[PDB]
Amino acid sequence: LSADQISTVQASFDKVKGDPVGILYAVFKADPSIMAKFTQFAGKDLESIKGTAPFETHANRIVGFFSKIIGELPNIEADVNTFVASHKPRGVTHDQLNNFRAGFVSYMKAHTDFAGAEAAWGATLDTFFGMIFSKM
Ligand code: HEM
Numbered sequence: 001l002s003a004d005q006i007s008t009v010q011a012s013f014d015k016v017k018g019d020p021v022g023i024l025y026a027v028f029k030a031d032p033s034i035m036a037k038f039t040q041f042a043g044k045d046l047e048s049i050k051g052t053a054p055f056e057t058h059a060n061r062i063v064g065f066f067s068k069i070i071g072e073l074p075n076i077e078a079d080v081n082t083f084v085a086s087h088k089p090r091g092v093t094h095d096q097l098n099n100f101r102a103g104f105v106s107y108m109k110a111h112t113d114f115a116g117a118e119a120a121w122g123a124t125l126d127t128f129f130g131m132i133f134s135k136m
Helices: 003-014 020-030 053-071 077-090 094-111 114-135
Strands: none
Touching: 003 053, 003 114, 020 053, 020 094, 053 077, 077 114, 094 114
């Protein structure tokens, strides 16, 4: 992960960072078992909660932290540590983490011309999920 790849990803992300709700929708849709961990959304229709105030609040927190991480590449260890501390006790699995990744990438492909940033994103996400999976 070097500066050329980091700048590519950060340019790519800048295009979509204003759509937290859409990104979170894509993740929940890829794996409903992620959605079922949120007491506020469990048992409701994703298509119906997507436009509500609670969904936006959550989406802003979650994608907001992801945004922190993308902004500081590659110096991400401390933030991954914080992530693991809050999420390890919620029992998040590797499967769910990989579905988060899949949902995100699906979002990016459906909303930008992704072909040009695809390798850089690969490097970034392999690094990020690489660190998480070494810790939980
Ligand atoms: C993919 C599996 C994941 C699951 C099952 C999951 C689940 C949750 C749950 C249950 C909460 C608490 C909601 C609440 O009570 O308010 C939460 C909050 C949060 N999640 Fe995750 N999450 C996942 C992935 C991620 C990822 C990849 C990030 C990185 C951006 C992230 C960042 C956050 C943040 C910042 C919060 C708010 C602070 C907190 O309560 O921890 N989550 N998530």
